[PDB]
Amino acid sequence: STGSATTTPIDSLDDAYITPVQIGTPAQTLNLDFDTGSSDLWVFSSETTASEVDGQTIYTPSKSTTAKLLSGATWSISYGDGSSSSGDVYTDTVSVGGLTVTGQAVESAKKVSSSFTEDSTIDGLLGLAFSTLNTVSPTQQKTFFDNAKASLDSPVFTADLGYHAPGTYNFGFIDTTAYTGSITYTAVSTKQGFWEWTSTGYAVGSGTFKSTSIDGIADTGTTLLYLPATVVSAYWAQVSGAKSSSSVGGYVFPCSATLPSFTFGVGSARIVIPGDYIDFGPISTGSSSCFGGIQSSAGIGINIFGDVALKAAFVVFNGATTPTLGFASK
Numbered sequence: 001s002t003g004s005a006t007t008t009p010i011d012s013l014d015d016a017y018i019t020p021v022q023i024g025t026p027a028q029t030l031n032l033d034f035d036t037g038s039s040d041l042w043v044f045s046s047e048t049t050a051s052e053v054d055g056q057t058i059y060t061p062s063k064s065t066t067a068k069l070l071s072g073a074t075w076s077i078s079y080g081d082g083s084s085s086s087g088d089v090y091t092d093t094v095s096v097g098g099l100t101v102t103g104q105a106v107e108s109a110k111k112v113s114s115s116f117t118e119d120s121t122i123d124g125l126l127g128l129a130f131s132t133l134n135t136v137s138p139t140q141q142k143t144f145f146d147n148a149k150a151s152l153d154s155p156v157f158t159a160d161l162g163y164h165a166p167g168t169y170n171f172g173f174i175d176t177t178a179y180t181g182s183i184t185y186t187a188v189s190t191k192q193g194f195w196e197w198t199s200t201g202y203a204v205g206s207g208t209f210k211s212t213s214i215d216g217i218a219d220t221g222t223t224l225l226y227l228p229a230t231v232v233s234a235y236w237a238q239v240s241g242a243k244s245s246s247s248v249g250g251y252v253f254p255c256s257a258t259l260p261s262f263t264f265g266v267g268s269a270r271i272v273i274p275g276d277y278i279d280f281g282p283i284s285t286g287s288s289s290c291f292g293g294i295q296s297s298a299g300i301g302i303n304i305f306g307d308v309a310l311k312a313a314f315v316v317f318n319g320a321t322t323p324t325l326g327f328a329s330k
Helices: 144-149 229-236
Strands: 003-009 017-023 029-036 042-044 068-080 084-096 099-112 124-127 156-160 166-173 184-187 194-202 210-216 225-228 243-245 250-254 263-268 271-272 279-282 290-291 293-298 303-305 314-318 323-330
Touching: 003 084, 029 042, 042 084, 042 290, 068 099, 099 144, 099 290, 184 194, 194 279, 229 250, 250 293
Parallel strands: 029 124, 042 099, 210 303, 225 293
Antiparallel strands: 003 017, 003 166, 017 029, 017 084, 042 124, 068 084, 084 099, 156 166, 156 314, 184 323, 194 210, 194 263, 225 303, 243 250, 250 290, 263 271, 279 290, 314 323
16 A cells, blocks of 8 residues: 655745645544654643633544554653653554554553644644654553555655645655655664664765764754754854844854755765755744744754754655665655
């Protein structure tokens, strides 16, 4: 089997991407944030505290003839950005772009943190990291990809995120028309439950390439590119007027400035992030100060190849017995 779904930016800045997901019988369609940095499929639901729902589409298990309470099961997650949610668990039929999993754990939110409430466009998350990170207790549950894997034509999914435009998640096949040149594959460590890999280095604009190992995760659920402070400093030093602002919480720059590209290495291959991808607009309405899309990972404890990086590539998440990651230009 295969599946193929369009993923759509939630706003004009590509702050996140939502993908429609069918849950239950008859189908309830929710727009979920596909997140290769976590491993829970959780949704706004009829069980969510009423005051914490503000425009989201909810899953109502009682209206699904295939929903079954996973008795005794609870879940609770906190994300790197300080947000969180928790609740109980159902199993139900879940379909993505034609690909159907029966008995998928659907984690129903009783509580969500304010950032989730305040974002009307995201109805939940669909985690695509390794199932070892799944928070369901007492019995850890598998991700949608893990459940589908054996049935897929090939045990892979791909992320093709657009810049200020829709893109595609495919399951079970590699669309050879979706990228240029070849796909370069690189090793993955699953020891922290992430799609964790080591970039071979970077360049800033037309600058020479710096060969240096950068361990990080391929994370569709994180908006920006978070790299070591040395790397980030070298980037913004090439932007006139750029500065790190403690009050804003990162590098900002005047919108009149031209942003250089940023290149990262995948083995001997090179992925070029155009400068425009690194502009996240005014810090506040009407401000001439713009927020940067490359920021320091210092104090996160890990480097994160988020959407800013991934949307410059066609990315293969290869779930073979030994997982690997593939990157192509496009």
